[PDB]
Design an enzyme around this catalytic site. Structure first.
Site, short mmCIF file in Angstrom:
data_model
loop_
_atom_site.label_atom_id
_atom_site.label_comp_id
_atom_site.label_asym_id
_atom_site.label_seq_id
_atom_site.Cartn_x
_atom_site.Cartn_y
_atom_site.Cartn_z
N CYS A 161 -3.02 101.38 -38.84
CA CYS A 161 -3.80 102.51 -38.37
C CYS A 161 -2.66 103.07 -37.64
O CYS A 161 -1.84 103.30 -37.99
CB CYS A 161 -5.17 101.92 -37.54
SG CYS A 161 -5.93 102.71 -36.65
N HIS B 106 -2.69 105.73 -39.99
CA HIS B 106 -3.96 106.71 -40.06
C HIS B 106 -4.18 107.63 -40.16
O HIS B 106 -3.06 108.59 -39.75
CB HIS B 106 -4.86 105.91 -38.48
CG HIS B 106 -7.00 106.61 -39.06
ND1 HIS B 106 -7.45 107.63 -38.44
CD2 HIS B 106 -7.29 106.03 -39.08
CE1 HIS B 106 -8.25 107.73 -38.77
NE2 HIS B 106 -8.51 106.90 -39.43
#
Ligand code: CL
Ligand code: CL
EC number: 3.1.2.-
Lengths: 187, 187
Positions: free
Chosen positions: A105, A125
Site C-alpha cells: 500500500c 497503492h
C-alpha cells in the site's frame, strides 16, 4: 528451524494490512513478531482498531535476523516508518544480508525514504505512486503483487491476502502457500 | 444520524474476520463498537493477534439498539458466542426489532445455538456446514455472501471484504458501498 518474520507496527498503520499478513504467516507456521515502532504499548491503527504488539521494535530488533521484514501500509503509518532511524537500520541490514523485504500500500514509500532496493520493479497503492516514484528510483508496476528479487510489494487492503501468500511462497514454497490458501475461501 | 454496528469479539475469534468488517464499516461512516464478550480487556484471537475492544459487551449491550449486530467467525470464537446468554439476548432483541444480523465463517453457528432466523438461506465456512445444518433449520448456500432478508452470512477470511461491503450496502446503500470499495483494490 521455522522461518521468522518481523512486522513493524506504527501508529496509523492500516489494520487490515497488518492483521491479514500476520494471520496468514502464522497459518504457514512462520514465527511472527508484531513489533511496535513506538514501544510496547497498544497501537491505534488508521481505522481505530487497537492492536497490542508482541514486543517493542527496540527489543525485537535485537532478536534478529529475520527471514522477512514486513511493512504494512496506511498513509500515516508509512510516514512514521519512513521517519524512523531504527527502521532505516533494520532495512539496510536486511538488504545487506540478502533477506526478503515485503511492503504493501503506502508501505513501499518507506523503502524510498531509506534508499532500499533502488532499480526494482515495485507496486504501491495507486494514491502512493507519485510519492514512491519521486526521483525515478524504481520502475512502477500495476500488478496486484510485484516481486523483483528480494523486494516484494503490493497495493492495498484488498491485496493483503495475495501479498501474504506471496511471502509464504517465497519463504516456505508454493506447496505450503497453496495449502494455506485453500481454507481461506479466497476469490 | 449515523448507523451503528455492534461487533462481538470473543476469545478465539478469527482476527481477519473481526478487523476487516470493522475497518470497512468505519470507512462507510458507520459508528462501530468492538465489544469484548468477556469484559473490557484485550482479546487473544485465533492466530494470536491481540485486539483491545472499545467496550465490554456488558456495557455496550446497554447502549443499543444497533443497526447491525456482527458475529465474526473462528471455530473457538463462534463456540464462545454460541454459549453466551448475553449474545442470545442481543440476537433475539435484534431479530424482534427487525434489525440486520451479519455472521461470517463459523459465526453463523451461533445463530443456530440461539435459534435465530430459522428457515433462512445461509452460508458458512465449508467446515462449519455440518454444525450449522444440524436439524435442518436452515437451507444451505455456497454463495460467497448470502442474504435472506435480515440474515446476512458469509464464508471465510477471504470473503470478509465482500461480507463487510454487503453490510455497508444493506445499511447505507449501493452507492456508498461502491465508493468505499474502490480504494480497497479488491479483485
Ligand atoms: Cl490510509
Ligand atoms: Cl478458526
Amino acid at each position: 528451524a521455522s522461518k521468522r518474520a518481523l512486522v513493524i507496527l506504527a501508529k496509523g498503520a492500516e489494520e487490515t494490512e497488518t492483521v491479514i499478513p500476520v494471520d496468514v504467516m502464522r497459518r504457514a507456521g512462520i514465527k511472527v513478531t508484531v513489533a511496535g515502532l513506538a514501544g510496547k504499548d497498544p497501537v491505534q491503527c488508521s481505522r481505530d482498531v487497537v492492536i497490542c504488539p508482541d514486543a517493542s521494535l527496540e527489543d525485537a530488533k535485537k532478536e534478529g535476523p529475520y527471514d522477512v521484514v514486513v511493512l504494512p501500509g496506511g498513509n500515516l503509518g508509512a510516514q512514521n516508518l519512513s521517519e524512523s532511524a531504527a527502521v532505516k537500520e533494520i532495512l539496510k541490514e536486511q538488504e545487506n544480508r540478502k533477506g526478503l523485504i515485503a511492503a504493501i500500500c503506502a508501505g513501499p514509500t518507506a523503502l524510498l525514504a531509506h534508499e532500499i532496493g533502488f532499480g526494482s520493479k515495485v507496486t504501491t497503492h495507486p494514491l502512493a505512486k507519485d510519492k514512491m516514484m519521486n526521483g525515478g528510483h524504481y520502475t512502477y508496476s500495476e500488478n496486484r503483487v510485484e516481486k523483483d528479487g528480494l523486494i516484494l510489494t503490493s497495493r492495498g487492503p484488498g491485496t493483503s491476502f495475495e501479498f501474504a501468500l506471496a511471502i509464504v511462497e517465497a519463504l516456505n514454497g508454493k506447496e505450503v502457500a497453496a495449502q494455506v490458501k485453500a481454507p481461506l475461501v479466497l476469490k
